[PDB]
């Protein structure tokens, strides 16, 4: 009732279905700062020791 | 060449002895240790790899 005699349509469409709630979990990777922390104050030569 | 020729050595012995027994009778106070902090860092120029 809101379209017209000539209709516009779409041929293909993609969606993902799941059967078990367990399949809704995925994985990502991180850096683990606890054992390999980010560095600060880069390497420098010694001078002005006080 | 008599007993008068030993006064300086006798005085040296007396110095050592009085210092020793004056230290022996001294009472020691256990001082509290303060001023413990990490304020001994080192400086220098950065290397700052170029590229």
**Documented resolution in Å:** 3.7
B50 touching A, CB under 8 A? no
Q: For A45, name the nearest residue in chain B, comparing CA atoms only.
A: B44
Inter-chain contact B47–A47, Cβ cutoff 8 Å? no
Q: Exposure pattern of A7-33 as b/e (b: 16+ CB <10 Å)? A: eeeeeeeeeeeeeeeeeeeeeeeeeee
Q: What is the CA radius of gyration of chain B?
A: 28
Q: The tokens of B51 are what?
A: 């590229």
* Residues facing B6 on adjacent strands: none
Q: Reduced to 3 DSSP states, what percent helix, strand and coil does chain A have, rounded to the nearest 5?
A: 10, 5, 90
CA atoms of B45 and A44, how far apart (whole Å): 6
All residues of chain B having their beta carbon less than 8 Å from the beta carbon of residue A43 are: 47
Separation in Å, CA B43 to CA A40, A41, B36, B38: 14, 11, 21, 14
Angle, CA B44 vertex, CA A48 and CA A49 arms, to 5°: 25
3-state secondary structure of B18: helix
Q: Are A39 and B46 in contact (CB under 8 A)?
A: no
């Amino acid at each position: 009732a809101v379209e017209m005699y000539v209709a516009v349509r779409i041929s293909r469409f993609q969606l993902e279905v799941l059967r078990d709630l367990h399949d809704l979990v995925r994985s990502r990777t991180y850096l683990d700062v606890s054992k390999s922390p980010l560095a600060t104050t880069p390497i420098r030569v010694v001078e002005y020791v006080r | 060449m008599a007993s008068t020729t030993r006064l300086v050595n006798d005085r040296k012995q007396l110095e050592q002895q009085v210092k020793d027994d004056a230290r022996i009778l001294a009472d020691a106070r256990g001082l509290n240790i303060t001023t413990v902090a990490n304020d001994s860092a080192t400086g220098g120029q950065a290397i700052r790899n170029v590229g």
